[PDB]
Amino acid sequence: SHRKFSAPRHGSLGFLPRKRSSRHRGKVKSFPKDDPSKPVHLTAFLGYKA
Amino acid sequence: SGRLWSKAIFAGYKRGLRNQREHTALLKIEGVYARDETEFYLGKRCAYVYKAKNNTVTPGGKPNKTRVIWGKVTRAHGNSGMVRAKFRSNLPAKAIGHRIRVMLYPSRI
Amino acid sequence: VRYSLDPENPTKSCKSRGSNLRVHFKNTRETAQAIKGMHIRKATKYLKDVTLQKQCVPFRRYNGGVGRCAQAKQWGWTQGRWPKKSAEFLLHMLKNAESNAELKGLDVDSLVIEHIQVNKAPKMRRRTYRAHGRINPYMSSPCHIEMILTEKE
Amino acid sequence: TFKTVFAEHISDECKRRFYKNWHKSKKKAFTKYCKKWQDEDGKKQLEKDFSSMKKYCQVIRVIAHTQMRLLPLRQKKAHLMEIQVNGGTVAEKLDWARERLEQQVPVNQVFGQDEMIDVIGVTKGKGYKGVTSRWHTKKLPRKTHRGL
Amino acid sequence: QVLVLDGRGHLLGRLAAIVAKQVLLGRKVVVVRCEGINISGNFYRNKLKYLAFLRKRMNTNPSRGPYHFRAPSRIFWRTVRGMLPHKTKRGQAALDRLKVFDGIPPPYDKKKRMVVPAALKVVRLKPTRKFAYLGRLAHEVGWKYQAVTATLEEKRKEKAKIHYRKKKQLMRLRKQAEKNVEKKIDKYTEVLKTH
Amino acid sequence: AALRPLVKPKIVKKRTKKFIRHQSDRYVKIKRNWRKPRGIDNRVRRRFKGQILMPNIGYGSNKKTKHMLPSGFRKFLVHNVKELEVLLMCNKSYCAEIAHNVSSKNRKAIVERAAQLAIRVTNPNARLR
RNA sequence: AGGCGGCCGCCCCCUCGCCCGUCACGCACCGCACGUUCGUGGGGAACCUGGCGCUAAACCAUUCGUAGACGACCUGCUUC
RNA sequence: AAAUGGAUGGCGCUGGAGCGUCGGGCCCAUACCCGGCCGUCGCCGGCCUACGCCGCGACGAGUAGGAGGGCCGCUGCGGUGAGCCUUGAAGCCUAGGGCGCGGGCCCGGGUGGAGCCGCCGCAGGUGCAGAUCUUGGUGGUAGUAGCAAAUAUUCAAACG
Ligand SMILES: [Mg+2]
Ligand SMILES: [Mg+2]
Ligand SMILES: [Mg+2]
Ligand SMILES: [Mg+2]
Ligand SMILES: [Mg+2]
Ligand SMILES: [Mg+2]
Ligand SMILES: [Mg+2]
Ligand SMILES: [Mg+2]
Ligand SMILES: [Mg+2]
Ligand SMILES: [Mg+2]
Ligand SMILES: [Mg+2]
Ligand SMILES: [Mg+2]
Ligand SMILES: [Mg+2]
Ligand SMILES: [Mg+2]
Ligand SMILES: [Mg+2]
Ligand SMILES: [Mg+2]
Ligand SMILES: [Mg+2]
Ligand SMILES: [Mg+2]
Ligand SMILES: [Mg+2]
Ligand SMILES: [Mg+2]
Ligand SMILES: [Mg+2]
Ligand SMILES: [Mg+2]
Ligand SMILES: [Mg+2]
């Protein structure tokens, strides 16, 4: 009680559901917000690490 | 043609907080919202109507799935027009929120 | 000796019995539930494929501590195991049932297994040696096996 | 998801993505759909969709895939994606997409040099490992019975 | 059969009480426009109470325990859960009878909508008291869908304004017709017996 | 439609449950026979509601209608012809019933003599050829 | 969270598609309940029927190793 | 101002569902009243098993404890039932039919293969949930832990 030497706690609790992903292709959680001012473009690609 | 019975919804048993009294029932009956209004409905009869997969009837023509438990109105209950009722056999308690016919039987006008 | 489930007619039915044969009761029950209700040629192909492990037998009731296999998804279940010895004894009992169909003179092709049953038998006791000089028994659990087969129409 | 429209022709890489066992499969994915593109009565029901798609939608995402014929991999299945078009109004976004159906999109057409661009993937596999290698916790000293 | 209730200017606890008693008897009730429910009290205390309610959680596994809904329809639904006996297999059928919808669905765009008078702000609150907006509260706390619901509500109010002019046109035509003649054979009997 | 005895009223039984022993559901080394629970803590003796009901003198049946079959007779067991002929005087209230260890050869003679004397036998057609 | 709502032109019939009035029968089942209903309700097994079409996909066995304690996961297996 | 996240019971509640003063209705306990039924007690009544029969009225909780009754039950003994049974007794099972408030019992159905019971008296080693009870058997745990000290086997053939 009162651990007498406060340590920074290991790991991060924000990444807690550590899990094999349901998909091995990495899906995009969110694309950036559009504006009607810019001309038409894309925002993503697939790639292969070499 | 036409409906002769008034509509009433089975609200529950006469009860205290803890224990019930299963030989009597309560009826919230539509169109009635006052102690003074629930005076016309005394002495009337009530009937519960349901289905069963055996084939048994009364003189209503031919064998049906339909079974009926009879009973009649005893007295008023509270200020909100709710009505106590006693049936010949006690309720199945499946019928909380299912419509019990109140017939125009013993009319006393 | 009698049988559970006196069949619908003994004219089209043949039967077989096994008394006090050294197997495991739980493995034989779980393979009997795999066999039961299947045609006899499929059952013979199945119990030839069990001993070569190309196709498994699901465990349903006695599922304690039994690991997974990929082959269990034919049975809609996730746990499987390949009992050799139970499959061998039940193959021998199916061959005896085939020979009794041959003796009664039936249509040898279109048999199905209408009824099968496995129940425990009077077990035999050996002993081991556990620590602090203690004895603990070491007992088998053999089974009796009934099967009643009927012609398909 | 409002409704999905695929192109007039679909290559074997995408069909191999839709199937599991290409050796067992009879290739029958997307024949009647291409026949709907082909016939004229199909086009009338097909051109009604792009009229509706202009009207209601905010977001249009474009489905594309990789060419596995160029890569030295063994995989031969094209991966599919959704790629949200963050251009202007829905009308010119849909005109852009229908103008560039069944075309190749180079990387130089979308990205540019010196552009700070984020990467999303899946990490390495190291298998079911223990506490000290997962959470970088500290080892107990030597004298511990039942584990360090 | 279906009691389609409006939500502008109702009170949370009062409307929950009346819906919770009506739902146990069988009349299938649907609460529409949940974002416009007013909560009595100052809304700083209302966000303080709901924020402390967010603080209330299990420390051992937050997946098992107090689910804190953020959508206002689900807020009202949790309030009715707290008033129906849901652990019994009576109240579970009651909650399955109850439906709730933030925004307005397409059946309920056109189905007529009732208003409970015993739960109105106009009836209950002495006018110098402060109130709340559950839409304001939900937008402050985690419900990220105000900007969609506002747009859809503007759209459907625009459509209702185009329907009401048509209905008022029909009523102008029928009162022009009743300004015309030869209905008066029946109207003496009708006025004698309550036109 | 056999003999139709004298006036027997609408019998009331006050409970038809043959009261069960406490915690006889939880075990099978407790048979179903009633036995007074004499524990120092036992809820049945303390008469908490929602527990089982102890039999006592209040549940007793009417002395007019004690030991009444639903047919309307009071039962009386019989072994042979003389003990059947004791009911020659009072047949309209007291029915006869042949004991279980009476053989069929004497059983048919008993039921025939009872059919002559017009005495109700509640199990007349069992154990025949 | 849309399948109901409406318009128009054609099609075989109704000019009682509603009120007031004349006229006479229809089961009048002889005092009695579970009657009328949205129902040509909802779901499943099959049986004869005309018309319109369709001729698959998983899982195992195998192979891979970007993945694996076992499962699970990524993959390959066209006669060029 | 206190350590897990929480308690006017909760939801909530503000022209009250808060505080204080009150009213009129309304809800209900085994309390009260009325009526039925059982038993105890008392007061009797009849020259109808007089140890039976009715009648009246007041009352009924309960551990330690004490009496009374039991046509409750187990085993045996004298008496008795012109008792019962190889045309099937004892015992056992029974989603069968009933009785008693119960102790328990009676019959039906099926197994079963040679003895069994009622009543009046009499005599007991006479009624089970427990005692870390005794003896015998079988479960869950479970087809799990475990078949790991001292390096090590492989191919072909034979008999089967
Ligand atoms: Mg997202
Ligand atoms: Mg395991
Ligand atoms: Mg050892
Ligand atoms: Mg030793
Ligand atoms: Mg690895
Ligand atoms: Mg040590
Ligand atoms: Mg105590
Ligand atoms: Mg509070
Ligand atoms: Mg007492
Ligand atoms: Mg013998
Ligand atoms: Mg006896
Ligand atoms: Mg006996
Ligand atoms: Mg003795
Ligand atoms: Mg003793
Ligand atoms: Mg014992
Ligand atoms: Mg004891
Ligand atoms: Mg012990
Ligand atoms: Mg023991
Ligand atoms: Mg054991
Ligand atoms: Mg292990
Ligand atoms: Mg092991
Ligand atoms: Mg060793
Ligand atoms: Mg050999």
Side-chain angles (χ1 to χ4, degrees):
Chain A
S1 67
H2 85 283
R3 294 176 62 246
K4 190 193 290 184
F5 295 102
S6 67
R9 189 262 312 147
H10 291 283
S12 179
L13 268 296
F15 292 156
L16 171 128
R18 288 177 177 176
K19 191 169 181 289
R20 297 176 189 173
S21 70
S22 64
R23 67 276 175 189
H24 83 282
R25 174 185 58 83
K27 74 182 290 186
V28 177
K29 294 290 187 181
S30 70
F31 299 98
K33 289 176 69 174
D34 53 352
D35 53 351
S37 294
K38 291 181 177 68
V40 174
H41 57 83
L42 294 178
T43 53
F45 273 103
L46 289 170
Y48 292 90
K49 182 178 175 184
Chain B
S1 68
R3 184 187 66 193
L4 294 173
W5 51 271
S6 175
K7 296 187 287 184
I9 298 171
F10 181 74
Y13 289 96
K14 177 193 283 186
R15 55 179 291 166
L17 177 64
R18 304 294 178 183
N19 48 3
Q20 292 184 358
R21 298 296 180 187
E22 293 85 3
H23 56 83
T24 310
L26 296 179
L27 296 177
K28 174 65 176 64
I29 178 160
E30 291 180 354
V32 176
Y33 298 103
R35 183 77 171 179
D36 287 330
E37 285 181 351
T38 173
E39 186 65 29
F40 181 76
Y41 278 158
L42 294 181
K44 307 288 188 178
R45 289 192 181 178
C46 297
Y48 178 64
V49 175
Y50 63 97
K51 301 289 188 180
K53 72 177 184 179
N54 291 321
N55 210 2
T56 61
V57 288
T58 203
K62 296 295 177 67
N64 297 119
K65 305 288 187 181
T66 305
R67 293 176 183 175
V68 159
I69 297 171
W70 289 99
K72 65 186 178 70
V73 162
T74 62
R75 58 181 288 169
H77 182 80
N79 286 319
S80 301
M82 196 171 288
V83 172
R84 295 181 189 176
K86 290 179 70 175
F87 292 174
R88 294 182 185 273
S89 180
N90 293 319
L91 273 306
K94 190 185 263 78
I96 42 172
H98 298 285
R99 192 168 303 277
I100 291 175
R101 300 178 183 176
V102 175
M103 205 66 64
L104 297 191
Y105 271 179
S107 140
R108 299 166 297 170
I109 294 97
Chain C
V1 292
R2 295 182 67 188
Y3 288 93
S4 300
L5 189 63
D6 296 330
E8 185 174 0
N9 46 358
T11 300
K12 296 192 293 181
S13 296
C14 67
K15 57 182 69 176
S16 176
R17 176 71 67 87
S19 299
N20 289 320
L21 52 95
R22 296 295 179 91
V23 290
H24 299 294
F25 171 70
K26 294 181 181 180
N27 288 321
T28 49
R29 193 262 178 192
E30 295 293 328
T31 191
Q33 287 302 110
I35 296 170
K36 182 172 182 176
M38 194 182 290
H39 187 73
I40 188 168
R41 290 192 298 269
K42 287 182 181 179
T44 300
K45 187 186 292 183
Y46 182 72
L47 268 71
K48 292 299 289 184
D49 288 329
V50 167
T51 60
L52 296 177
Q53 299 177 359
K54 289 172 69 176
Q55 189 174 4
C56 74
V57 173
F59 283 1
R60 296 181 184 272
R61 180 168 291 165
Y62 300 99
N63 55 0
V66 174
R68 299 177 182 90
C69 71
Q71 295 175 355
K73 290 182 181 179
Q74 278 77 241
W75 298 98
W77 191 257
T78 63
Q79 298 182 0
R81 192 182 290 274
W82 293 274
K84 302 288 185 182
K85 191 173 183 182
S86 299
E88 287 291 328
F89 277 92
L90 268 72
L91 179 62
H92 188 272
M93 292 300 164
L94 287 176
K95 188 180 288 185
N96 194 3
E98 177 69 26
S99 295
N100 296 329
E102 181 68 25
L103 283 178
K104 287 187 178 181
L106 270 71
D107 184 76
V108 298
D109 287 330
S110 66
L111 286 84
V112 296
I113 298 172
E114 186 71 26
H115 170 72
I116 201 166
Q117 180 182 0
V118 47
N119 50 4
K120 294 193 289 182
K123 59 185 179 295
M124 189 172 286
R125 181 180 65 85
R126 294 191 293 270
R127 64 185 182 181
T128 57
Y129 297 95
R130 306 287 288 164
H132 303 87
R134 286 190 290 113
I135 306 298
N136 287 120
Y138 194 76
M139 293 181 284
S140 294
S141 63
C143 72
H144 302 289
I145 291 170
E146 292 90 2
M147 61 180 71
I148 310 296
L149 277 73
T150 309
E151 284 184 348
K152 183 181 177 181
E153 67 181 2
Chain D
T1 73
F2 186 75
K3 63 174 68 176
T4 65
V5 175
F6 289 164
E8 190 178 3
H9 184 274
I10 292 172
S11 64
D12 290 331
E13 294 176 348
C14 292
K15 292 184 183 292
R16 187 168 291 175
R17 187 59 177 171
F18 287 115
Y19 287 113
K20 295 291 185 182
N21 291 316
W22 185 263
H23 176 268
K24 296 290 185 180
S25 66
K26 296 290 182 67
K27 197 180 179 179
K28 293 297 291 184
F30 290 91
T31 60
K32 296 178 181 292
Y33 187 77
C34 296
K35 193 179 289 184
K36 288 182 182 180
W37 269 90
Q38 186 67 43
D39 290 333
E40 188 177 2
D41 290 332
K43 288 180 176 65
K44 294 180 183 292
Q45 295 181 358
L46 201 279
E47 69 186 359
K48 191 184 289 184
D49 289 330
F50 294 112
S51 66
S52 68
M53 197 79 77
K54 290 180 182 179
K55 185 172 176 181
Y56 302 108
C57 291
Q58 177 192 5
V59 174
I60 292 174
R61 291 183 179 176
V62 172
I63 290 178
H65 70 279
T66 51
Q67 292 180 355
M68 296 299 293
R69 294 180 186 180
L70 292 176
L71 297 174
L73 292 178
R74 202 188 73 188
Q75 187 174 3
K76 292 182 183 293
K77 283 186 179 181
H79 295 285
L80 294 177
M81 283 290 289
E82 291 182 352
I83 298 168
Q84 174 170 355
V85 177
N86 284 326
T89 319
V90 184
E92 68 261 14
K93 290 196 286 185
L94 188 142
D95 284 331
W96 189 74
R98 289 183 68 247
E99 186 178 2
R100 303 182 74 251
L101 287 172
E102 290 181 354
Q103 290 183 356
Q104 299 179 3
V105 181
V107 178
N108 200 0
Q109 193 177 7
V110 169
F111 284 177
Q113 293 180 357
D114 298 330
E115 291 181 353
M116 187 169 284
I117 281 172
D118 299 332
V119 184
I120 296 172
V122 175
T123 62
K124 289 180 73 68
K126 271 85 74 175
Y128 178 68
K129 292 184 75 67
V131 177
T132 58
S133 65
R134 182 65 195 93
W135 296 92
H136 288 283
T137 187
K138 189 175 265 76
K139 286 177 69 176
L140 298 177
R142 178 175 178 84
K143 292 174 68 66
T144 64
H145 179 70
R146 294 175 183 175
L148 281 76
Chain E
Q1 292 296 319
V2 286
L3 273 301
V4 180
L5 293 179
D6 194 358
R8 175 65 64 191
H10 291 280
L11 295 181
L12 183 61
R14 301 288 195 180
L15 180 59
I18 297 165
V19 168
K21 187 60 183 293
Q22 289 289 325
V23 73
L24 286 176
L25 302 180
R27 296 177 70 186
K28 295 170 72 174
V29 58
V30 173
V31 178
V32 190
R33 280 187 183 173
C34 192
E35 70 176 3
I37 298 173
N38 297 323
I39 292 172
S40 64
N42 195 0
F43 69 99
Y44 186 72
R45 282 196 296 113
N46 289 319
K47 67 168 285 187
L48 188 63
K49 292 296 183 182
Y50 186 72
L51 199 65
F53 176 68
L54 286 176
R55 183 180 173 180
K56 305 287 185 182
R57 65 182 179 89
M58 185 184 286
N59 299 104
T60 68
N61 200 164
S63 63
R64 298 169 67 90
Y67 292 101
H68 310 290
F69 294 104
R70 272 73 176 267
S73 68
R74 294 289 182 182
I75 290 295
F76 183 74
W77 186 68
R78 182 180 175 88
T79 304
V80 179
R81 178 192 287 128
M83 295 177 59
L84 294 176
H86 66 286
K87 288 189 285 185
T88 314
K89 190 64 175 64
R90 184 187 178 186
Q92 187 167 359
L95 290 176
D96 291 329
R97 288 170 184 170
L98 177 63
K99 291 184 286 185
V100 67
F101 298 100
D102 47 353
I104 300 181
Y108 299 142
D109 288 331
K110 294 181 176 65
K111 276 188 273 187
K112 183 66 177 177
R113 294 176 286 109
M114 288 75 255
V115 173
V116 172
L120 289 170
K121 176 187 175 185
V122 184
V123 178
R124 289 294 187 185
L125 290 175
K126 192 183 289 183
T128 57
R129 300 295 182 185
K130 294 181 285 185
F131 58 96
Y133 292 101
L134 189 61
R136 174 71 177 89
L137 180 60
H139 175 70
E140 192 174 9
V141 185
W143 176 62
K144 60 180 72 175
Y145 291 154
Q146 190 184 7
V148 181
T149 308
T151 303
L152 296 177
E153 192 68 28
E154 296 294 328
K155 187 261 179 187
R156 67 161 299 278
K157 288 180 181 181
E158 180 65 31
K159 189 186 288 184
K161 287 292 184 182
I162 209 67
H163 178 74
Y164 180 73
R165 186 175 67 187
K166 184 178 179 181
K167 184 176 181 293
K168 187 168 70 176
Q169 183 70 40
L170 287 175
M171 189 168 285
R172 284 191 295 267
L173 285 174
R174 74 172 62 250
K175 286 190 182 295
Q176 184 60 254
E178 281 188 352
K179 192 176 289 294
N180 218 161
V181 203
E182 292 296 324
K183 302 173 185 177
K184 63 186 179 182
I185 300 171
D186 304 332
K187 286 185 179 180
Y188 292 106
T189 302
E190 193 66 31
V191 170
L192 283 172
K193 306 298 179 181
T194 310
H195 181 268
Chain F
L3 291 177
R4 296 184 187 274
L6 265 69
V7 193
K8 302 304 180 182
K10 292 184 180 180
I11 307 167
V12 289
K13 296 290 185 181
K14 292 182 172 68
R15 265 185 68 175
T16 62
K17 300 291 180 67
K18 65 181 298 296
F19 304 154
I20 207 65
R21 191 174 187 270
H22 177 68
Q23 287 184 351
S24 66
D25 50 352
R26 191 180 298 276
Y27 299 101
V28 292
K29 68 179 178 181
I30 297 170
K31 296 178 184 178
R32 293 184 182 273
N33 302 119
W34 173 254
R35 186 165 288 113
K36 175 67 72 68
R38 289 179 177 87
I40 65 171
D41 293 333
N42 201 348
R43 298 194 303 270
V44 180
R45 181 173 59 85
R46 285 179 178 175
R47 295 183 179 180
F48 288 163
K49 66 178 184 290
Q51 301 295 323
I52 63 170
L53 277 302
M54 295 189 291
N56 50 7
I57 197 68
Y59 292 103
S61 298
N62 191 3
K63 289 177 96 289
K64 179 65 69 175
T65 58
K66 189 183 284 291
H67 299 290
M68 287 294 298
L69 271 72
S71 67
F73 292 97
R74 298 182 181 178
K75 66 184 285 182
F76 176 73
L77 189 145
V78 64
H79 288 91
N80 51 2
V81 179
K82 292 170 70 176
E83 294 174 352
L84 196 277
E85 286 179 352
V86 73
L87 285 174
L88 192 149
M89 182 61 201
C90 297
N91 57 4
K92 286 181 180 291
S93 180
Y94 288 144
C95 67
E97 179 173 359
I98 306 168
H100 73 281
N101 50 1
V102 177
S103 67
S104 66
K105 181 72 172 179
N106 297 112
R107 188 179 177 91
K108 68 179 182 180
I110 288 171
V111 73
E112 184 67 30
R113 181 62 176 169
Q116 285 188 357
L117 294 179
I119 297 169
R120 174 71 67 86
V121 45
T122 57
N123 48 6
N125 53 3
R127 294 178 68 187
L128 291 175
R129 303 295 182 90

